[PDB]
Coordinates of N, CA and C in Angstrom, one line a residue:
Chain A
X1 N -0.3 -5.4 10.0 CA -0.7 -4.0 10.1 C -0.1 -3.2 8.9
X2 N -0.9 -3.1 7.8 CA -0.6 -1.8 7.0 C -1.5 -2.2 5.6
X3 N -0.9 -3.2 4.6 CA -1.5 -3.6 3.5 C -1.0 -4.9 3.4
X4 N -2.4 -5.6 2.1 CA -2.6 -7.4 2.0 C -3.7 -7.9 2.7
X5 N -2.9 -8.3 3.8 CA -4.7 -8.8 4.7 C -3.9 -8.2 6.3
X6 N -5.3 -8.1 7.3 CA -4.9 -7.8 8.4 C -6.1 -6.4 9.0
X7 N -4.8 -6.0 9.4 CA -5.2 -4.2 9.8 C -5.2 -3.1 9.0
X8 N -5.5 -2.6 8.1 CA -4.9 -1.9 7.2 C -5.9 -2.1 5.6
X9 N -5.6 -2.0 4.4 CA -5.7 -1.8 3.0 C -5.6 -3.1 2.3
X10 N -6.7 -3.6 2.3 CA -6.6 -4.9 1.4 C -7.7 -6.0 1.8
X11 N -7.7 -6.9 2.7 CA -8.4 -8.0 3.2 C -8.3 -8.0 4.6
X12 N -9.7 -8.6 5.8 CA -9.5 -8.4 7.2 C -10.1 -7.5 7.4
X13 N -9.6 -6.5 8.2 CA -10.0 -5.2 8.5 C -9.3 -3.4 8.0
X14 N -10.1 -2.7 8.1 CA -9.8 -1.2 7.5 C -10.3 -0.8 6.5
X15 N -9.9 -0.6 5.1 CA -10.2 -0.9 4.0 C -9.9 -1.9 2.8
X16 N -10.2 -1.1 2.0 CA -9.6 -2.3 0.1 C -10.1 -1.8 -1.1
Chain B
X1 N -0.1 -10.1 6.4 CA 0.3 -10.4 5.6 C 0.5 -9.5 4.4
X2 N 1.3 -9.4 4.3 CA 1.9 -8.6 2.8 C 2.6 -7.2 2.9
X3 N 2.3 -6.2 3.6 CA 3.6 -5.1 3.7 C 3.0 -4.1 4.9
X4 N 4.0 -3.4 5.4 CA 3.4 -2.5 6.7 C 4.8 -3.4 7.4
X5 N 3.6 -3.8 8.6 CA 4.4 -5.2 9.5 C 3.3 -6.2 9.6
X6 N 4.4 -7.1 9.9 CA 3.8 -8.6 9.7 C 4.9 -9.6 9.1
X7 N 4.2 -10.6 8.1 CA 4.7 -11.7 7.1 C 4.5 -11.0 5.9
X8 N 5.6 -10.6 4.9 CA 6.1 -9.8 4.1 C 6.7 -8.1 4.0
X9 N 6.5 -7.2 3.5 CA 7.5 -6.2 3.0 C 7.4 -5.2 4.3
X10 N 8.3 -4.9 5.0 CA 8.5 -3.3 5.8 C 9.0 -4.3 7.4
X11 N 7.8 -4.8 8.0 CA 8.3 -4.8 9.6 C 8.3 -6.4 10.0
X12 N 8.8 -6.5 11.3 CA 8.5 -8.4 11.9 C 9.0 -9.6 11.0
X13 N 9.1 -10.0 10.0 CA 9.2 -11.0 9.1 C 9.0 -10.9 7.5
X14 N 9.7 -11.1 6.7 CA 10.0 -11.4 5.4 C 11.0 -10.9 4.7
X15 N 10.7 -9.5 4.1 CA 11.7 -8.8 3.8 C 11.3 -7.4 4.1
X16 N 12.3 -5.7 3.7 CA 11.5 -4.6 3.8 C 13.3 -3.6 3.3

Protein backbone atom coordinates (compact mmCIF):
# COMPACT_ATOMS: atom_id res chain seq x y z
CA UNK A 1 0.00 0.00 0.00
CA UNK A 2 1.40 3.36 -1.09
CA UNK A 3 4.14 3.20 -4.03
CA UNK A 4 6.10 0.38 -6.49
CA UNK A 5 3.49 -2.24 -7.14
CA UNK A 6 0.27 -2.92 -5.14
CA UNK A 7 -2.30 -0.33 -3.87
CA UNK A 8 -1.11 2.87 -4.60
CA UNK A 9 1.51 4.81 -7.44
CA UNK A 10 3.35 2.59 -9.68
CA UNK A 11 2.19 -1.04 -10.77
CA UNK A 12 -1.13 -3.23 -9.65
CA UNK A 13 -3.63 -0.97 -8.70
CA UNK A 14 -4.34 3.09 -8.30
CA UNK A 15 -2.15 4.88 -10.42
CA UNK A 16 1.56 5.32 -12.28
CA UNK B 1 6.27 -3.70 -2.84
CA UNK B 2 8.51 -0.82 -2.60
CA UNK B 3 7.42 2.05 -0.04
CA UNK B 4 4.15 3.10 1.85
CA UNK B 5 3.70 -0.46 3.71
CA UNK B 6 4.51 -3.66 2.62
CA UNK B 7 8.20 -5.29 1.29
CA UNK B 8 10.44 -2.24 1.33
CA UNK B 9 10.55 1.59 2.58
CA UNK B 10 7.99 3.08 5.51
CA UNK B 11 5.72 0.08 6.99
CA UNK B 12 5.52 -4.14 7.64
CA UNK B 13 8.98 -5.20 6.26
CA UNK B 14 12.27 -3.95 4.83
CA UNK B 15 13.38 -0.80 5.91
CA UNK B 16 11.65 2.90 6.67
Amino acid sequence: VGAXAXVXWXYXWXWX
